[PDB]
Design a protein around this ligand. Structure first.
Ligand SMILES: Cn1ncc(-c2nc(N[C@H]3CC[C@H]([NH3+])CC3)ncc2F)c1CC1CC1
Ligand SMILES: Cn1ncc(-c2nc(N[C@H]3CC[C@H]([NH3+])CC3)ncc2F)c1CC1CC1
Lengths: 291, 295
């Protein structure tokens, strides 16, 4: 592969493609490799590579080493990254400290803002799609996986995509916005509402619309929707700082084509961080693991 | 599976094996750095991994020596966490179709002689010199050859007095038969000369693609070692090195002449290859055969 890549074993699945460890043979550089069957009916892997390329040089954006084809596979070779926030959540006993939640929130809001600044919406915000860096970037949260991403505004005019209804749910359900469940075209607000659920997930260990009964997938999604709509934010966020409710209310009240106030959202959490008297050392819970 | 050792290390996939254990790729969760992790399954009261880790500690700071992050116990395992390095010389040889240019062989020789001299300066002999136990650095240290695996190493002299260990016979055949010195095959206590003779076979292996005592099969380890030994003893150095610069044979003959307790002239051996390198018109620029690959 590429005058240089050894395909290794499979480690998981991303949107529209399995990921494998692999190695830059001459360099000795372990990499991540996403495979799409080159003969697939919906080739999207080179599309995804060009979105990554448009995001190049952004803080917390993964670098693409090589995109191409080999054998019967469109391949994308990515720099290797560390554990997911889900992985780190497990390593930390499925509890993060408030300090770590607020440190993550600041970076995650900014990562979303950056993607939006480059005319895209992510559409799959969840703990599995945020990875810590390696080496000198170990305290940098990366966002990965643009296989569900869409352009929400025209690159020349900045005209926003039009409002659409009766859409089927394309990510998966735990972190989806209310409007996504209701069939509304996703926009910038929905990425941010999903992040709000992710932050409550880290606070609680679970969300109250996990583990619901249904006969079929369609129904399961409908029941998750119903649970989200019928659980007031003040009940969802009971016993946690009011900032988490304020953040979610804000995102839920945004217009479809609104530019979110990302600075207001960061400032909510920063003000909380100041009130709590946490030190400005940028140390996460997992940085204190000792042998 | 996400497996975790020593509280702060993720243990990934197996990448190979070394002396007394398997090696795994991993990650230091707390410091955010990739590492290599060695695991020893303990079968007796006298395990090897902690002993090995102290050898590495004694060598710390040397050029081309990996740093150790942690060594400890977990269930029936000993675990040693190390600085991650790049591909081995055997990996690179395969990647290059089991052909290295002369320039590459001589760049490698210069550094390999130096790594062995450094281990000797710290009062140890390595005892399993082979391509698999030399790794290139990562990134900006990619021009640097590292030496690894001290599981079979031994102290050969006193640190203060330089008193050398005694000559002994009837030793077991430790190491790798392909690259072992003739004295090692004969059961003689290993010393500095034997590390350097092994290096000489490595260099000819790189020149040839294989050594002429590869391929032979036996029922037992002794019979295998013997077939190799006989072929080694019965193949003159000038027949082994036929069609290659005279320096390769001069190197092996020098090593074979050394007395058990002789201090090798490492400088002479380096100069022998450097003089060749320059007479061939090569530029000393750390440009190895694998660095010439285009996109
Ligand atoms: C979905 N996706 N897309 C790209 C990558 C992806 N994954 C990694 N490393 C993984 C190592 C195992 C850890 N448990 C998770 C991170 N590095 C870079 C990537 F782009 C991934 C995560 C891989 C686990 C599938
Ligand atoms: C035997 N041993 N002991 C320590 C190490 C060892 N291996 C590495 N990296 C390996 C990455 C994959 C490459 N294919 C080979 C080198 N870094 C540091 C080490 F100490 C090794 C080499 C690993 C292949 C087993």
């Amino acid at each position: 592969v590429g005058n240089r890549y050894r395909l290794g074993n499979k480690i998981g699945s991303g949107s529209f493609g399995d990921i494998y460890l692999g190695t830059d043979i001459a360099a000795g550089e372990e990499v991540a490799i996403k495979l799409e069957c080159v003969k697939t009916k919906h080739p999207q892997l080179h599309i995804e590579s060009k979105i990554y390329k448009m995001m190049q040089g952004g803080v917390g954006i993964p670098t693409i080493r090589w995109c191409g084809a080999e054998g019967d596979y469109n391949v994308m070779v990515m720099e290797l990254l560390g554990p997911s926030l889900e992985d780190l959540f497990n390593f930390c006993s499925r509890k993060f400290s408030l300090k770590t939640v607020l440190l993550l929130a600041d970076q995650m809001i900014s990562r979303i803002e950056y993607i939006h600044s480059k005319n895209f919406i992510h559409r799959d915000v969840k703990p599995d799609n945020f990875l810590m860096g390696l080496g000198k970037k170990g305290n940098l949260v990366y966002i990965i996986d643009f296989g569900l991403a869409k352009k929400y505004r025209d690159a020349r005019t900045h005209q926003h995509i039009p409002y659409r209804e009766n859409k089927n749910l394309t990510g998966t359900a735990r972190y989806a916005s209310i409007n996504t469940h209701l069939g509304i075209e996703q926009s910038r607000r929905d990425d941010l509402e999903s992040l709000g659920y992710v932050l409550m997930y880290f606070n609680l260990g679970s969300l109250p619309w996990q583990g619901l009964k249904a006969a079929t997938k369609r129904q399961k999604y409908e029941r998750i929707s119903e649970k989200k709509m019928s659980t007031p934010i003040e009940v969802l966020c009971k016993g946690y700082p009011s900032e988490f409710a304020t953040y979610l209310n804000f995102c839920r009240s945004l217009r479809f084509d609104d530019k979110p106030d990302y600075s207001y959202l960061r400032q909510l959490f920063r003000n909380l961080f100041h009130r709590q008297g946490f030190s400005y050392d940028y140390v996460f819970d997992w940085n204190m693991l000792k042998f």
